[PDB]
Amino acid sequence: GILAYALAKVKEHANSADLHSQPAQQSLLSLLQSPLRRYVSIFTALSLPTYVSLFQAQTYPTRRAIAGEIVRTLLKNQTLISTPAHLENVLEILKVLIKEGSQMEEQGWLARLVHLIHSDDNDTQFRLLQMTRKAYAEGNERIRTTTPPLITAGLKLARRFKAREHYDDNWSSQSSSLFKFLHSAISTLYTRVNGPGVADLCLRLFCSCGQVADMTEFEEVAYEFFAQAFTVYEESISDSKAQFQAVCVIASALHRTRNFGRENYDTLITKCAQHASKLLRKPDQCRAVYLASHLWWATPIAARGETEDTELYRDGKRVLECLQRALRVADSCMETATSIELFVEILDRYVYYFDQRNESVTTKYLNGLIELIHSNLAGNQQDSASVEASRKHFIQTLEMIQ
């Protein structure tokens, strides 16, 4: 009765003291606060929508300040709980949100939502899910960080979902659509050319989802995606560090995934390794190269392919070759010091394969290595902290290795 019935009336009449923050606005606000502040049940007010329509005639700054305030308060902790309607409400507001001035806790918002979700049906989310993605089209500028909580919200749900299907078995559908949806959205995203860190992030999202795809079954769609994921690794990552983190994910992500066979792999393995072999950052590079041994390895689950359909990546040849190449990094060292720290390290590694029943592997190299470490270690020396350290390390190791 105020709201339209004086106030809307007024508002059409006066655009003649008008708003953004003037005392009329202030009043309008305070007033607007008044329920809220008193409230515990602000919800009928969003059905008051003189109000709602009136948000339009507010500035975006103030839309956040109250609405936000509300979110925030509700984020301090939410008052009341769901019905379909509130999804709507959410949306009305979401419409205020996505645009309604511009393209700032929208993260924190993201969070409530991200919370709020788990109890009801597939659909709600879907409606929303959908809305929201569309709602994600409005940006170009704060975003990197902003899409992922949703990603997770779905992911979590997605597992929670994986954790329920025998009535739903339409996970497939949902998924399908969703992944697709996602994918589509995703393809959109990269392509929204925009960002540093894009590669990294996207990837991590690929990982999350992709892996989730590993645990959940749907491998079919994987290689393309993955092929795409690698591309990102090749083009559009560009820093040593960025890379450092990212390849650890590639390797690792691949490591709890296992879907592809060897088929996919021979092409892929040679390549990752190649990229790896096309990285130019030495500490990191050898350790990994010998670590690439673990790709075929009996330890563990990662070392398998379901294109083939189940179990470890039996056969020595590449594994050794990897060590030999790791060794090639060693070979191309020339700078010794680090070479030894590493040799030792390789040695530590040698101890792993001693323990791994690395059958094919024959002592002659182990011997060649222990000897080689010793030869350099002892056989040459100069002023170093490292010479002290080397002994501590030596000591540790000897006790450790048994």
């Binding site: 960080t145 991590r204 960025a242 450092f244 670590l291 673990h294 390290e345 792993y352």
Partner: protein, 184 residues
Amino acid sequence: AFLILVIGNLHIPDRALDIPPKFKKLLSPGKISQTLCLGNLTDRATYDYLRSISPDLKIVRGRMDVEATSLPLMQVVTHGSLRIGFLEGFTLVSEEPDVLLAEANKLDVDVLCWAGGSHRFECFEYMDKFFVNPGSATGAFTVVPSFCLMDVQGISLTLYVYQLRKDENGTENVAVEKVTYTKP
């Protein structure tokens, strides 16, 4: 004395969502001495917050942490002369025991905190060493968030791992277990 917080698995406000109120209570500025952070923040606001905890955010990136606000990948810290290591764990490609032990050497580190892929939050002594995922520590995941207040004495660390368990105690429930540690 030393209140070295050791913390794993987060991704705020992502895998770990809010700061659990007890954490919110717990973590007031400067007071905590050192934060040894095992990456994937994800967030900067939160980065400002890590800073806000103590007078030290001692930092080492994760593989579910992109770019870098300014992030220094790995860092070794000494208290006493324990080289107390942290990294998010990224450098790995294999969670296998001898690997953990090895790793400690490669970096010149002797206590290892890492975050897992099934987002581990598990620590056990194996080969006199503790290979440590203090993992979940703020609400993250692959329920016990945990982090430790630690008093490092030399090479040895004694950890009181404080574990946060949601329980029908109607609280974020703190159970503390002390585990004591010596670096070789």
